[PDB]
Ligand SMILES: CC[n+]1c(-c2ccccc2)c2cc(N)ccc2c2ccc(N)cc21
């Protein structure tokens with residue numbers, strides 16, 4: 498009931514306006530008082546963390562259901578996961594506009610990031626196997642994730658605008674990202 | 682001076698809201714009526730094209746003033762141009778955010794695209810020498826441009842948020858971009 502409605506409103510409002518989406522606005526759009534929102538979530542940051550996990554779970558389920566586990570070559574496995582990733586974002590654009598902003602907000606706790614990484618162990622493992630070491634470090638991992646998110650967002654935008662060439666934007670985005678971020 | 686007021690306000694508005702920025706908002710922010718805005722620019726698309734050339738010319742004049750012709754190695758010259766590009770965006774974050782939204786808008790005329798392309802000859806010809814075929818193509822050059830501007834904006838935002846490590850973000854952003862977009 499109202500927990501879900503609050504997460505839907507925060508999805509719509511964060512997609513519409515970014516993190517600095519007003520909790521008054523989100524509460525209003527969920528049809529309760531702002532005091533009720535702060536009863537369900539101790540702080541705005543708690544609400545951000547919870548919404549990120551809910552959206553990440555939805556994305557990870559979608560990618561997992563498409564996984565061909567006979568594939569073991571790192572690049573081919575990552576290509577097919579990328580396809581699934583860009584497809585989810587084209588199919589759920591508000592969810593995706595909500596999630597990418599939470600990901601770079603620097604508001605996510607280490608526990609949340611860790612739970613998010615654990616939602617899809619094969620992808621977590623493939624990062625360890627293939628991403629340039631500097632982009633797995635504590636100092637530069639956020640930057641490597643921002644570069645990735647930037648390349649995936651651009652690919653989604655070009656594919657959504659021009660569906661006839663979506664496949665080709667997805668393939669050219671993937672090869673560019675793989676050259677940008679992976680072991681040489 | 683109203684024309685310059687209107688271009689400055691359109692920059693701030695497009696940085697914030699993309700090309701869906703409101704002409705009513707832009708005009709009110711410049712201190713003029715919307716009808717006045719349409720006396721200077723008869724369509725929103727004319728405002729978009731004029732602003733894009735004004736911002737591009739500013740950025741290119743900045744890079745040309747910084748060009749060091751002692752650098753005779755192509756990748757190194759491209760790196761130092763990159764450093765000037767990132768520095769311009771860190772000095773002028775709304776200008777670069779607006780240029781990126783304008784460049785990827787599908788509203789620029791062929792005339793505008795031709796004028797932009799020949800503002801900085803050394804750079805135009807470094808691109809022709811270095812960029813992957815497919816990102817020079819009629820079909821996919823606009824996507825190559827989108828990927829570059831996404832990588833550049835990412836680098837700017839990290840360098841601005843964490844200035845202690847700005848040089849390292851600039852260098853890692855450049856190396857990622859070079860691998861993404863250039864030839865064997
Ligand atoms: C930057 C790591 N990275 C990789 C990745 C890229 C290249 C090789 C291996 C994994 C990834 C690959 C696909 N297909 C889909 C999503 C992600 C991704 C998603 C979020 C994030 N924060 C990092 C992510």
Ligand SMILES: CC[n+]1c(-c2ccccc2)c2cc(N)ccc2c2ccc(N)cc21
Nearest residue numbers: 759762763766807808811812826829862863
């Ligand atoms: C993608 C072309 N590319 C190159 C470039 C990239 C790699 C090799 C040679 C040139 C570039 C290099 C520097 N440093 C600064 C700006 C640009 C740039 C700027 C805009 C654009 N639309 C394409 C641009």
